[PDB]
Scaffold this motif. Structure first.
Motif, PDB file in Angstrom:
ATOM      1  N   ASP A   1      -9.322   9.746   5.016  1.00 27.52           N
ATOM      2  CA  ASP A   1     -10.207   9.306   6.084  1.00 27.52           C
ATOM      3  C   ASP A   1     -11.259   8.362   5.514  1.00 27.52           C
ATOM      4  O   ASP A   1     -12.073   8.758   4.667  1.00 27.52           O
ATOM      5  CB  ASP A   1     -10.876  10.487   6.777  1.00 27.52           C
ATOM      6  CG  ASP A   1     -11.392  10.118   8.139  1.00 27.52           C
ATOM      7  OD1 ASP A   1     -11.301   8.913   8.487  1.00 27.52           O
ATOM      8  OD2 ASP A   1     -11.893  11.023   8.854  1.00 27.52           O
ATOM      9  N   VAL A   2     -11.236   7.120   5.985  1.00 28.14           N
ATOM     10  CA  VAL A   2     -12.141   6.079   5.539  1.00 28.14           C
ATOM     11  C   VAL A   2     -12.430   5.233   6.768  1.00 28.14           C
ATOM     12  O   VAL A   2     -11.528   4.566   7.293  1.00 28.14           O
ATOM     13  CB  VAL A   2     -11.545   5.221   4.416  1.00 28.14           C
ATOM     14  CG1 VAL A   2     -12.197   3.841   4.377  1.00 28.14           C
ATOM     15  CG2 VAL A   2     -11.682   5.940   3.083  1.00 28.14           C
TER      16      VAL A   2
ATOM     17  N   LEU B   1      -6.413  -6.884   1.991  1.00 29.45           N
ATOM     18  CA  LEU B   1      -6.544  -5.973   3.107  1.00 29.45           C
ATOM     19  C   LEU B   1      -5.485  -6.327   4.126  1.00 29.45           C
ATOM     20  O   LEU B   1      -5.311  -7.503   4.456  1.00 29.45           O
ATOM     21  CB  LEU B   1      -7.934  -6.057   3.735  1.00 29.45           C
ATOM     22  CG  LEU B   1      -8.016  -5.089   4.914  1.00 29.45           C
ATOM     23  CD1 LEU B   1      -9.097  -4.078   4.755  1.00 29.45           C
ATOM     24  CD2 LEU B   1      -8.193  -5.822   6.212  1.00 29.45           C
ATOM     25  N   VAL B   2      -4.779  -5.313   4.618  1.00 31.12           N
ATOM     26  CA  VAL B   2      -3.823  -5.460   5.709  1.00 31.12           C
ATOM     27  C   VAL B   2      -4.316  -4.660   6.905  1.00 31.12           C
ATOM     28  O   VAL B   2      -4.864  -3.566   6.755  1.00 31.12           O
ATOM     29  CB  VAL B   2      -2.409  -5.011   5.297  1.00 31.12           C
ATOM     30  CG1 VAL B   2      -2.388  -3.528   4.961  1.00 31.12           C
ATOM     31  CG2 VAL B   2      -1.416  -5.358   6.395  1.00 31.12           C
TER      32      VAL B   2
ATOM     33  N   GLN C   1      -6.081   0.029   8.977  1.00 32.59           N
ATOM     34  CA  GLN C   1      -6.489  -0.935   7.965  1.00 32.59           C
ATOM     35  C   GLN C   1      -6.646  -0.253   6.628  1.00 32.59           C
ATOM     36  O   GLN C   1      -7.168   0.857   6.524  1.00 32.59           O
ATOM     37  CB  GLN C   1      -7.765  -1.698   8.318  1.00 32.59           C
ATOM     38  CG  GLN C   1      -9.033  -0.929   8.327  1.00 32.59           C
ATOM     39  CD  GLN C   1     -10.141  -1.744   8.970  1.00 32.59           C
ATOM     40  OE1 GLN C   1     -11.312  -1.577   8.637  1.00 32.59           O
ATOM     41  NE2 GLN C   1      -9.767  -2.655   9.891  1.00 32.59           N
ATOM     42  N   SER C   2      -6.180  -0.945   5.608  1.00 31.22           N
ATOM     43  CA  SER C   2      -6.010  -0.332   4.313  1.00 31.22           C
ATOM     44  C   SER C   2      -5.926  -1.453   3.282  1.00 31.22           C
ATOM     45  O   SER C   2      -5.471  -2.558   3.589  1.00 31.22           O
ATOM     46  CB  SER C   2      -4.771   0.564   4.349  1.00 31.22           C
ATOM     47  OG  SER C   2      -4.249   0.760   3.076  1.00 31.22           O
TER      48      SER C   2
ATOM     49  N   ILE D   1       0.845  -1.183   0.000  1.00 32.48           N
ATOM     50  CA  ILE D   1       0.000   0.000   0.000  1.00 32.48           C
ATOM     51  C   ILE D   1       0.882   1.236   0.000  1.00 32.48           C
ATOM     52  O   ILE D   1       2.001   1.231   0.523  1.00 32.48           O
ATOM     53  CB  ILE D   1      -0.979   0.026   1.202  1.00 32.48           C
ATOM     54  CG1 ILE D   1      -0.292  -0.460   2.475  1.00 32.48           C
ATOM     55  CG2 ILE D   1      -2.205  -0.831   0.901  1.00 32.48           C
ATOM     56  CD1 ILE D   1      -1.166  -0.352   3.698  1.00 32.48           C
ATOM     57  N   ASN D   2       0.365   2.301  -0.593  1.00 30.84           N
ATOM     58  CA  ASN D   2       1.052   3.581  -0.645  1.00 30.84           C
ATOM     59  C   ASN D   2       0.594   4.535   0.425  1.00 30.84           C
ATOM     60  O   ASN D   2       1.345   5.420   0.810  1.00 30.84           O
ATOM     61  CB  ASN D   2       0.798   4.244  -1.993  1.00 30.84           C
ATOM     62  CG  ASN D   2       1.491   3.544  -3.114  1.00 30.84           C
ATOM     63  OD1 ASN D   2       2.531   2.901  -2.927  1.00 30.84           O
ATOM     64  ND2 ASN D   2       0.864   3.577  -4.280  1.00 30.84           N
ATOM     65  N   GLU D   3      -0.645   4.417   0.861  1.00 29.09           N
ATOM     66  CA  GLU D   3      -1.219   5.358   1.801  1.00 29.09           C
ATOM     67  C   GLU D   3      -2.114   4.561   2.751  1.00 29.09           C
ATOM     68  O   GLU D   3      -2.396   3.388   2.520  1.00 29.09           O
ATOM     69  CB  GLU D   3      -1.953   6.452   1.038  1.00 29.09           C
ATOM     70  CG  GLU D   3      -2.948   5.872   0.060  1.00 29.09           C
ATOM     71  CD  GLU D   3      -3.465   6.865  -0.970  1.00 29.09           C
ATOM     72  OE1 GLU D   3      -2.820   7.910  -1.176  1.00 29.09           O
ATOM     73  OE2 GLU D   3      -4.540   6.600  -1.564  1.00 29.09           O
ATOM     74  N   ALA D   4      -2.512   5.180   3.854  1.00 28.71           N
ATOM     75  CA  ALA D   4      -3.322   4.475   4.844  1.00 28.71           C
ATOM     76  C   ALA D   4      -3.800   5.488   5.853  1.00 28.71           C
ATOM     77  O   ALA D   4      -3.190   6.541   6.031  1.00 28.71           O
ATOM     78  CB  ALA D   4      -2.557   3.367   5.574  1.00 28.71           C
TER      79      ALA D   4
END
Ligand SMILES: O=C(O)CC[C@H](NC(=O)c1cccc2ccccc12)C(=O)Nc1ccccc1Oc1ccccc1
Ligand SMILES: O=C(O)CC[C@H](NC(=O)c1cccc2ccccc12)C(=O)Nc1ccccc1Oc1ccccc1
Ligand SMILES: O=C(O)CC[C@H](NC(=O)c1cccc2ccccc12)C(=O)Nc1ccccc1Oc1ccccc1
Ligand SMILES: O=C(O)CC[C@H](NC(=O)c1cccc2ccccc12)C(=O)Nc1ccccc1Oc1ccccc1
Ligand SMILES: O=C(O)CC[C@H](NC(=O)c1cccc2ccccc12)C(=O)Nc1ccccc1Oc1ccccc1
Ligand SMILES: O=C(O)CC[C@H](NC(=O)c1cccc2ccccc12)C(=O)Nc1ccccc1Oc1ccccc1
Ligand SMILES: [Cl-]
Ligand SMILES: [Cl-]
Ligand SMILES: [Cl-]
Ligand SMILES: [Cl-]
Ligand SMILES: [Cl-]
Ligand SMILES: [Cl-]
Lengths: 240, 240, 240
Positions: free
Chosen positions: B118-119, B47-48, B38-39, B23-26
């Motif tokens: 933001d998610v 998903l990690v 989590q992202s 992943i690049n962002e989180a």
């Protein structure tokens, strides 16, 4: 001219310390010893090498050479010597020769020379407001690390290294205490290209300490003692 | 103010190295119970989920709750300026994140700009798995690396066997129940996974000697590394 | 059915690692006496000959003589999935089967497609050579590596001397008789060889701490690495 240097490791590291910064230089062979002066192709920096004739075993020098070595070619040749070989440099009075020993393997390379002629500037000892002596390993990691943050490091004395880039910015503080020694006369702050500082650190194998000498009125000096023989001085102008 | 101090800061080093190639962002969810991330990867097949409990820090502060949008590429670059022994401290106020590396007279302060990522986190409950395998992390890593030189996909099955097939030939590795190897197997189960994502997952191998694989034909595979005394890195991956 | 089990499977790893960069395929000659490989590089200027005797294997079963056409690029790729401590078993009823046994924790089975490649081996007889140099493999690899940055070709001559000449300059390496160096000179020879193939040959260096060069002016250069207990790897190379 002939100079036999037991512990050629030095000559190896010297060439390694030069080749990334400059591609050629005039080697000024003389009776007092080997002395080199050269600027990178952008003239932002100047490196000066000094191997004194006392640090060489043997050593002999009839006339004054203005040897134009291709520093790429010399470093290539110099990678064929093991770290323990005994390097000798013989040059009569248009091609230099090099000899590596042990004592069972012995190697004779011979490097075509080159017509480089620029005279040497006379560069005297300036006065610096801030002079820092620190472990050379530490200094190399600081330039390596900060250079993943930005292109330029700001150096300050009150010593601090700061870099500002896109992702954010960082700074490393270092305090007087291998030892860390700060010699101030006046607070000083200048910005430098990490590109060239990271060239200079390729001399790190030549000494465990490094010395930084900053003033607003002269280029930065970054110097590595080639113990029992001389030094590698790097001079770096600031950014504007 | 949020402020977490981790003496064993190499954990943070290892966690970013375990995330950045996936992943690049989180969004880092910072709360008084600790850090929770989590992202999903850009292609939405994995998903990690990271858990670092507050009690597992040497020092935890969290006045207000935070959702930090973080550029994992930027944060990883920063975290490589830390030595493996550095004490790392994370700090933020109520827009950017601060990281502090404590060597013992070198001290580094980096500042990272945040972002608007933001998610709201999903609730991921415990599932029931037809087969569950606990193995040495390094062996799991080696198997996935080996088979990816054979094919693109791995077939995992219990009764445990890892199989790959490609243009070169085919191969399969049998592990037997006994670090130890442990197969709770309430069900034969056989599924197929993209080795590309498994090989991303195994970048968390440094964080623990053991890895836990949970499979079921009804739910994503779960690859789990425990972060001793502090939480876990959980990777979820969809089959076929 | 063919089945050779090698407890020191690393020997197969190194053997394939020593052939892959020279040849991409070869017919393997499987008989009761063992394994015999004779292949030439696609330029037809060099010939590699591999002997692994049956008594050098832990078990050796050959029910029927074979000529396996093997894709050496495939078989290297598979053998990299073996750990250096693994027991390695080759087996063939078509296809070739490789078995890797870790003891035994993990057990790996790989299967490779054969190909139609069957030339008949030729009788290389024991020639007579003018000069036979036995030396450290590692030194011979270093000489070839070193000189290949100076020139394309090495001139070998019998003391023994390796010479290379190029755009940079020239270089000579002399090894005197003295692991030991022993030069058995019958009449001085002087042959020039492409360093590009000698550097292929030296990929075998892990098989033996000793290499043996053998030269006459009437026959190809022979470069031999013994494979303790099993046989040898003979590289043969034509001069210019
Ligand atoms: O954190 C980051 O990397 C940035 C945000 C990113 N979004 C997507 O990947 C993404 C974008 C657009 C449509 C989708 C459709 C399916 C799956 C993912 C996406 C992410 O990871 N979301 C996320 C993080 C953690 C738990 C769930 C996540 O998504 C959701 C959210 C709601 C319900 C299903 C899944
Ligand atoms: O083809 C495509 O792009 C879709 C990819 C696919 N679908 C969804 O994620 C999806 C689509 C639409 C609504 C949802 C609502 C909730 C959850 C997921 C979805 C997928 O593989 N998820 C996935 C793969 C691996 C581990 C978990 C996954 O899901 C999650 C993600 C977060 C927490 C729970 C489960
Ligand atoms: O048909 C039914 O209702 C049950 C069976 C079905 N399973 C899958 O689609 C499925 C099978 C195998 C791997 C996957 C990987 C990614 C996404 C889906 C699958 C389903 O809908 N699950 C489900 C129902 C409701 C909420 C989530 C669901 O999935 C989950 C569950 C946990 C974490 C991610 C997703
Ligand atoms: O095994 C592989 O890699 C493919 C097969 C390969 N053939 C050639 O290289 C090749 C193809 C076509 C014309 C040639 C002309 C001259 C030299 C080589 C070739 C090979 O190794 N032959 C071979 C292997 C072992 C002993 C001799 C070999 O050749 C011969 C055979 C008969 C008399 C002379 C030489
Ligand atoms: O194509 C070009 O111009 C060069 C190719 C050249 N010739 C042949 O292979 C060749 C051509 C015509 C009839 C033969 C009859 C018998 C053997 C070889 C030939 C070559 O270099 N061989 C070679 C180079 C290095 C080590 C051995 C070599 O030969 C071999 C090969 C196999 C066993 C014995 C010796
Ligand atoms: O010089 C003279 O006139 C007589 C000697 C002459 N040597 C070569 O051709 C020659 C010299 C140097 C390297 C090579 C590399 C590859 C191929 C040939 C040569 C000759 O006929 N050999 C010969 C005669 C009959 C069958 C094969 C022959 O080659 C051989 C011999 C052994 C193993 C490979 C090949
Ligand atoms: Cl230049
Ligand atoms: Cl000095
Ligand atoms: Cl992403
Ligand atoms: Cl936990
Ligand atoms: Cl080939
Ligand atoms: Cl033998």
């Amino acid at each position: 001219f002939e100079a036999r240097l037991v512990q050629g490791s030095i000559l190896k590291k010297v060439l390694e310390a030069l080749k990334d910064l400059i591609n050629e230089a005039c080697w000024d062979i003389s009776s007092s010893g080997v002395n080199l002066q050269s600027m990178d192709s952008s003239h932002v920096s100047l490196v000066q090498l000094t191997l004194r004739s006392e640090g060489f075993d043997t050593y002999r020098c009839d006339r004054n050479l203005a040897m134009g070595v291709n520093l790429t070619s010399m470093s290539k040749i110099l990678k064929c010597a093991g770290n323990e070989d005994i390097i000798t440099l013989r040059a009569e009075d248009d091609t230099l020769a090099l000899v590596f020993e042990a004592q069972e393997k012995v190697s004779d390379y011979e490097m075509k020379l080159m017509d480089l002629d620029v005279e040497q500037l006379g560069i005297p000892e300036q006065e610096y407001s801030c002079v820092v002596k620190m472990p050379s390993g530490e200094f190399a990691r600081i330039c390596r690390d900060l250079s993943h943050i930005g292109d330029a490091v700001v150096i300050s004395c009150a010593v601090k290294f700061s870099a500002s880039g896109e992702l954010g910015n960082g700074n490393i503080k270092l305090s007087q205490t291998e030892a860390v020694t700060i010699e101030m006369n006046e607070p000083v702050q200048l910005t430098f290209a990490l590109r060239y500082l990271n060239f200079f650190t390729k001399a790190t194998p030549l000494s465990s300490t490094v010395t930084l000498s900053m003033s607003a009125d002269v280029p930065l000096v970054v110097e590595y003692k080639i113990a029992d023989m001389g030094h590698l001085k790097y001079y770096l102008a600031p950014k504007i």
